[PDB]
């Protein structure tokens, strides 16, 4: 009963090969990613063309950055075993908050209202904006039965879109009731890719271009961004 949908590449772009995909999104016309490099955590603001940087911090040696969201002229980043996260002002990626949560962040995105965070289980998070403090939870289940591993997030026009981890499928999310409403298989978009660097590592990382509708899938150490349509299987 659950659509599975197919993809289309509309166009390739240079992505780090050294770059852990661990947040992902797209604001004011360029990418905005939270990488692992060697060791260390960085928030960079991308040129999607080129995929260079044109600003960068780097995390303390403390701190290992995963999610990440814009939130009005805000970021909003989560960590990987710190329990906590940060906000910086998204012109000059100056922190001017820190704050707790419970348990561990792993993706992070925002709709109208609230920002949405994953943590590897099931149960995604709604986060009140102000207070930084979950006033919803929900968990989510394909064919009725819980589906672990969430990891990066997006809204995409009122559905939650998640990577699940381990796989190559994106998982679509009704955020009323936490049901996978869809599938989209990318098994075999690495065939695609052009020449892949080693190591390699998985599907990680959606973006969302709401002015111009333009979907984008990378993932950790991927040698490209995808842009990509969708259509329905069968
Ligand atoms: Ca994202």
Redesign the pocket.
Known sequence: SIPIYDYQIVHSYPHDTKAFTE???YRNGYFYESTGLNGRSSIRKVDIESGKTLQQIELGKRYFGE???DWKDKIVGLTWKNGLGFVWNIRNLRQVRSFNYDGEGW???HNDQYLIMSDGTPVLRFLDPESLTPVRTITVTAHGEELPELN???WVDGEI?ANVWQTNKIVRIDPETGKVTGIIDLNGILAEAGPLPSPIDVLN????DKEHHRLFVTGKLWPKVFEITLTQRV
């Open positions: 947040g992902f999104f999610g990440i969201s993706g992070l995105t990066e997030l997006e879109f990382g959606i973006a969302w």
